[PDB]
Design a protein around this ligand. Sequence first.
Ligand SMILES: [Cl-]
Length: 131
Amino acid sequence: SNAKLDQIRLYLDQKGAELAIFSDPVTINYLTGFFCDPHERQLFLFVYHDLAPVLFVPALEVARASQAISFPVFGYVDSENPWEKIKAVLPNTAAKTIYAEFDHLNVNKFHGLQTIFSGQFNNLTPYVQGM
Ligand SMILES: [Cl-]
């Protein structure tokens, strides 16, 4: 397992949360060693407290991501709705308590994620700042 993601999973367990969703390319590179500029496209790292983590990227990034990342990586092409695709590829969307990076995630992305996850969202930025 990824040592830094082991620390996130402990944090989630200590907070009684089931899922962290990272969106900031800088945090994602900190955690995984993959750096992305997604432009207008979607980029998320889903760190379940128990399941394998999942990287979600534009299709054009899959090959590069896969060179550095051994856990699941899924892409979406431009003709696909990214929110429907996340729903289609993730093992589980039932988390009751979710952490996300409120200092990076824009309101449109936040609302997008809320069409998939009905759980309560909490701010991850205190954890991120403290690494
Ligand atoms: Cl891992």
